[PDB]
Symmetry: C3
Subunit: 317 residues, 3 copies
């Protein structure tokens, strides 16, 4: 009178399909998802310092558009620019806008240090009704619009050495008048010139008189440029007209800072990974939410699902 001893394994009534070397679909007892495909829709305000630009681009906060004055000296790990942002100061362009935005974003600070530039024989603090600050005309807070004093605008020739142990970022510009009358009325000379240099490098910009499209009452424009001055080097600014002068420099840093375009609201929560769609968990190695990310994130892939088998082959009965 014997006995039977059967060896076996478990099964489940409803298995999951996975891919292998030999099968595009085969059933196993269990699997887990490796692609993060959803977001909360919200950017968590920890553990990264999130700075909401609201109505302001980083560049407008940098220049000091009056409605962006609240951003003076701000810092961030991630600056968030909104699609509703608008400019409301002198109409301007930045040749290589993208590079200036990038280098400031990456620096992570708008810390500004005022310097005592001496502008001999010119009028300082020019403004416009296109850039109101309170009820009266105004200007970008970090820039100093120089014009004639009496009936002359002399050749400006000034210096600022960098005797600190950090890099200085200087933002400056050039005014493009609408007419010859505007040019001579403001700067006396019929044609201006701005040359900004360090020991190693230089930029010279010739203004261009003429009409651009009307923006906030003006066919004139300002063009924005930048110059980095390293320790031991020196800034020199040289102009006989049309200079939009720096008031000082921005302190530069290196680190983890960046910038992102997103309309996702900011919320009080914790998430290492941020996308423009909102924060996403980072327990999974891959994600299909957005190729734009910031922080400790799963890697972006095209697949919306990939199943890692966590059990044996499911052979039901």
């Amino acid at each position: 009178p014997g006995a039977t001893l059967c060896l076996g394994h478990h099964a489940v009534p409803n298995g999951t399909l996975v891919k292998t070397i030999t099968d595009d679909q085969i059933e196993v007892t269990n699997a887990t998802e490796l692609v993060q495909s959803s977001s909360t829709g919200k950017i968590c305000n920890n553990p990264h310092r999130i700075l909401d630009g609201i109505d302001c681009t980083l560049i407008d906060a940098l220049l000091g558009d009056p409605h962006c004055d609240v951003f003076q000296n701000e810092t961030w790990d991630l600056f968030v620019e909104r699609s509703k942002a608008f400019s409301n100061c002198y109409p301007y362009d930045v040749p290589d806008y993208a590079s200036l935005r990038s280098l400031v974003a990456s620096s992570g600070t708008l810390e500004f240090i005022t310097e005592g530039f001496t502008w001999t024989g010119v009028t300082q603090n020019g403004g416009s009704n296109a850039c109101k600050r309170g009820p009266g005309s105004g200007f970008f807070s970090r820039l100093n619009w120089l014009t004639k004093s009496g009936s002359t605008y002399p050749v400006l020739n000034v210096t600022m050495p960098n005797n600190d142990n950090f890099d200085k970022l200087y933002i400056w510009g050039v005014h493009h008048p609408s007419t010859n009358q505007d040019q001579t009325s403001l700067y006396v000379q019929a044609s201006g010139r701005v040359t900004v240099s360090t020991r190693r490098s230089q930029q010279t910009i010739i203004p261009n008189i003429g009409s651009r499209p009307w923006v906030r009452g003006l066919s004139s424009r300002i063009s924005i440029y930048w110059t980095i001055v390293k320790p031991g080097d020196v800034l020199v600014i040289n102009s006989n007209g049309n200079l939009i002068a720096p008031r000082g420099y921005f302190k530069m840093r290196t680190g983890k800072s960046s910038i992102m375009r997103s309309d996702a609201p900011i919320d009080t929560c914790i998430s290492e990974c941020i996308t423009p769609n909102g924060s996403i968990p980072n327990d999974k190695p891959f994600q299909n939410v957005n190729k734009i990310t910031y922080g400790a994130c799963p890697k972006y892939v095209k697949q919306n699902t990939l199943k890692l088998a966590t059990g044996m082959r499911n052979v039901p009965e």
Copy 2:
């Protein structure tokens, strides 16, 4: 007297060598090639719309070099530029030629819409014997060479708003005269200026008088620039001399369009994948024909062969010879 039952497997007289984790070469019963290494030498005319440039670069077709007039308003999935292409109009350069070529190639169309620009106090439709159109002097079809009327060239100041819901591409230029006599003779003012702007952006170009190498009779040149005007924005052109004016705009699109340099002839066949060497099949995952491709193509690799084993190890009977 019992019986013997032997288990076994097949072998074949002619195996193939494959690579594994442990072996650089080991013999299996069969294998299949994963690298496409040959082409027909011909570009198949389907399923993609292939436009043969023949004697014309895309840029010459865009500007409207007379021998390229047949390309007016053309469209393509793949524009094919030939090594025999030549220019035969006013000598010109395009700063950032590569970008203009790229953005037009990618747009996939030369559809041109003429606009009623008003050029007050200048002579229109200037031409050159370097750019013959029929028996007489001519010019790029899409550009309008403005010069003095009587003894004056006034400050030109014109606008064109974009009230459409698509982007407009404007092509314009600046004429560089050979001498001061040429400059004043054509434009009166001793030095010209072209400023083209939108709300957001602006380009100002100062012409430069002097000799460049003689091309079709001329040491002068034209430089070509472009400006995209989005819906709701406006073009403004401002000049007191040397303007080579747009006659209108090109309609821009987005899609699958591109451009390829190839001398391969175009033939009647069907192939998703195109290389400069000709079309190639796409049944294999890899290819070693050319890193330049267009369409549904195998991925370019350096190996000219890679064998995927499709059978077991091939073990012939121990050899008595």
Copy 3:
């Protein structure tokens, strides 16, 4: 009284840890290192031709800064630029410095061929005490500083066709005077212009008068430009002032040549792979020494060690 026959395998007392699919660390009898993590600290002078720049950047050797005259017509597989290099001639900048440095580095030669440019009505061979040669003033050896003859500087208009079967590299420049007095004193015309062209392309540079920081006595500058002329094409140079003229061309090659920034000393040894830290062996497939390499090198990875198991699982007694 029968017998026992035990099958077994070897072990060692002290095994090595490797990583697998299932284990972060598991012990095997032996393994071999796949990441090269050390260097000698020295650059081997074979089998690649190493040219030590010493006190000279490649660009200064190219222009012919006097202390770099020893590099005239030199060749290299790898030009090594040292952090102690300095400039000691007219102060200058190169817009797109990085591209000029790259294309020269890649050409692998400073072979210079003098051409008989005819400069009618100007004074040739201008120099400066910022660029001393012998007891007197001097200049970049490969450039010809043109100034007025008598009371005129005429429109210069010269041509040079390329009837060779190689590309010609022309280096030229533009002088930026410190003052209007300097400009008219040297060139007569109040504003200069340099136009350098080939059949298909052209560059025009307007000089900019004004002060830059003092370097070796000077607030003036030279800006350096280049033009490649292919076989069958032709150079034209046209100027009414401020031209720093080429004396000829550099003969261009294509091949394996490059440039590296390193302070590692050069030694007599053999190594295919060079990093800025020094030469490294290339018996391993990966390396963690430096992402900058030249020659037959292991691929750069972030891991400092990766162990390929060369034996079975170690199960000691």
